[PDB]
Amino acid sequence: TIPKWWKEAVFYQVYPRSFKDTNGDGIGDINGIIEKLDYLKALGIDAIWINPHYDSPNTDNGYDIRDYRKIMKEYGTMEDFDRLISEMKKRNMRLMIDVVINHTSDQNEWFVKSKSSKDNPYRGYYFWKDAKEGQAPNNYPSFFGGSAWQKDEKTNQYYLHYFAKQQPDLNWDNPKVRQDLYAMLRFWLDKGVSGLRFDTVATYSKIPDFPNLTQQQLKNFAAEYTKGPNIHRYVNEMNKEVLSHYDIATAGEIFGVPLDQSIKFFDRRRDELNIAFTFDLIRLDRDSDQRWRRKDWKLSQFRQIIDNVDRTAGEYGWNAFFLDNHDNPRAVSHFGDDRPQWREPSAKALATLTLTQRATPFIYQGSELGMTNYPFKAIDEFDDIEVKGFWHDYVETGKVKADEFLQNVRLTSRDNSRTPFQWDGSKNAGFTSGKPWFKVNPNYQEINAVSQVTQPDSVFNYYRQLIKIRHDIPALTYGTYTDLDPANDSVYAYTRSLGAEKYLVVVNFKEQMMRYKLPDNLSIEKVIIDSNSKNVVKKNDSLLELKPWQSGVYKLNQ
Numbered sequence: 001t002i003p004k005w006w007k008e009a010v011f012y013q014v015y016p017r018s019f020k021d022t023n024g025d026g027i028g029d030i031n032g033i034i035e036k037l038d039y040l041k042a043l044g045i046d047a048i049w050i051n052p053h054y055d056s057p058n059t060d061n062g063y064d065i066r067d068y069r070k071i072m073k074e075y076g077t078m079e080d081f082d083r084l085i086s087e088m089k090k091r092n093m094r095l096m097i098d099v100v101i102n103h104t105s106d107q108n109e110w111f112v113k114s115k116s117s118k119d120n121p122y123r124g125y126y127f128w129k130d131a132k133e134g135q136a137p138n139n140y141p142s143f144f145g146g147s148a149w150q151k152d153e154k155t156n157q158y159y160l161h162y163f164a165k166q167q168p169d170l171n172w173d174n175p176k177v178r179q180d181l182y183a184m185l186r187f188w189l190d191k192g193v194s195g196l197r198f199d200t201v202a203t204y205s206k207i208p209d210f211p212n213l214t215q216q217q218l219k220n221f222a223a224e225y226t227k228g229p230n231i232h233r234y235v236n237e238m239n240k241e242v243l244s245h246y247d248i249a250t251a252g253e254i255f256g257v258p259l260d261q262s263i264k265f266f267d268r269r270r271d272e273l274n275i276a277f278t279f280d281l282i283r284l285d286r287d288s289d290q291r292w293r294r295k296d297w298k299l300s301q302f303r304q305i306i307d308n309v310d311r312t313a314g315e316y317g318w319n320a321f322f323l324d325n326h327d328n329p330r331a332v333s334h335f336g337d338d339r340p341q342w343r344e345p346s347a348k349a350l351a352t353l354t355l356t357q358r359a360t361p362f363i364y365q366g367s368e369l370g371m372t373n374y375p376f377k378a379i380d381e382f383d384d385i386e387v388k389g390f391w392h393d394y395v396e397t398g399k400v401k402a403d404e405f406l407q408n409v410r411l412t413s414r415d416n417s418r419t420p421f422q423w424d425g426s427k428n429a430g431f432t433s434g435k436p437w438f439k440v441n442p443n444y445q446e447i448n449a450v451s452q453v454t455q456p457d458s459v460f461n462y463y464r465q466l467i468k469i470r471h472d473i474p475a476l477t478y479g480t481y482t483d484l485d486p487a488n489d490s491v492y493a494y495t496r497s498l499g500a501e502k503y504l505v506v507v508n509f510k511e512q513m514m515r516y517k518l519p520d521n522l523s524i525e526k527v528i529i530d531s532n533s534k535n536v537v538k539k540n541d542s543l544l545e546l547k548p549w550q551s552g553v554y555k556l557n558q
């Protein structure tokens with residue numbers, strides 16, 4: 001166990017575009033983040049991870065980068081960015097930025113040159129291939145719909161894009177590409193950035209000769225794209241030439257990587273990355289083939305995945321833990337119950353388990369308020385290119401009826417987490433003086449930061465209390481994680497232990513009162529915190545009477 005600031009820190013993720021607008025154009029910006037640092041400090045946040053802040057045409061809201069060395073026009077200036085770093089440092093907060101180097105915008109200078117001719121010096125910065133029998137090079141599908149190969153009539157070849165056609169993949173097999181990327185990383189790291197979150201880090205290495213995927217592989221192509229023969233060689237080379245020269249925290253977004261293989265990216269002995277962003281938990285109820293469709297899940301599955309993720313990190317790796325983010329539905333809607341009667345208690349319950357995992361917790365903007373999914377009705381209400389791609393592939397082809405599709409994407413769309421942050425009860429929830437780029441959830445009159453910061457029993461203040469408790473108790477960061485019963489579908493209970501310091505965490509996932517007798521002669525010394533409960537717990541109790549959605553943290557005897 002090696003203590004590190006990034007294992008003990010409580011991170012907060014800010015999606016700039018939807019956090020706080022300060023110029024009235026309806027788009028959140030860097031000055032807006034700066035304006036709200038005192039709010040985040042009050043919450044108790046130690047580090048902020050911001051989504052892409054670089055010059056971009058926004059086909060994928062920042063993840064299609066046109067110029068890596070320029071600030072996104074809508075977000076502000078380089079001076080604004082340096083000020084954010086300064087203002088955060090003054091508050092002992094650290095900044096983590098998003099590194100998107102699997103692909104660039106098709107407007108990026110490198111691609112503009114690459115596509116201009118087969119002999120351009122930059123041709124090999126991307127993947128260009130001839131048609132196979134007048135068709136795409138192979139059957140690779142794109143995550144955002146259709147083929148991962150886009151035809152360019154000028155040079156009579158197709159280029160590879162795992163994501164949007166406007167996101168051509170960089171050729172990491174070209175040493176010149178790697179060297180230019182490392183130089184770019186240094187440009188940002190030398191500005192004082194404390195962390196890097198690597199976007200789709202496991203797909204940098206492409207499969208030699210691009211052979212077709214089998215019928216089976218097509219059902220989970222994401223996993224096939226993480227099987228490049230040089231991925232670890234490249235991540236480790238990046239560590240040796242760049243990462244190891246700074247005291248930074250690096251997170252790896254390893255979507256598609258089988259859990260068993262994830263440790264190769266985060267085992268500290270391997271000199272690759274630091275913090276694992278696994279997706280086994282957050283996608284537990286998602287179809288792996290029709291990635292927009294959801295299915296029913298049970299608490300036993302949820303906790304069994306957590307146990308597997310914990311065991312996989314083991315002694316040498318380290319995990320992040322989050323229940324939502326900008327690519328997934330809101331935590332309270334997904335894992336809790338967002339109906340008016342249960343939103344606040346279930347949100348507090350999820351906050352309790354989040355802040356007490358043996359992992360670095362990441363709180364997504366607005367979930368500290370209990371923000372919920374957005375009430376989408378028609379397909380034209382979505383901004384997300386991913387849902388549009390699924391719509392084209394599944395509904396426009398007649399494979400799935402529009403109503404069944406909408407029933408599912410209302411619950412799974414990334415856009416559920418991209419509606420503007422709900423600051424107060426004023427027009428557009430105080431997010432902007434103009435017209436928001438994406439509509440504000442009508443529930444902002446009931447759910448907003450101003451209403452909650454001064455109410456001691458608010459969701460915001462429950463997160464604040466839990467963050468302080470985590471900061472105060474080492475066992476809640478480093479303690480061994482033990483699930484008391486992986487097969488229990490009603491009461492989630494586990495202990496966090498560091499020597500003689502042992503804590504119990506309990507969450508009643510059912511909307512009925514539950515009695516829960518502790519196992520193995522465990523008994524309670526004292527309550528640390530609890531939520532949605534008026535029941536009295538006393539010294540030596542070994543049985544808890546749990547109200548619906550009740551959660552709590554207890555110090556155990558011995």
Ligand SMILES: OC[C@H]1NC[C@H](O)[C@@H](O)[C@@H]1O
Nearest residue numbers: 060063163199200253327
């Ligand atoms: O860059 C492609 C994809 N990578 C993962 C990011 O979280 C998501 O927002 C983005 O669209």
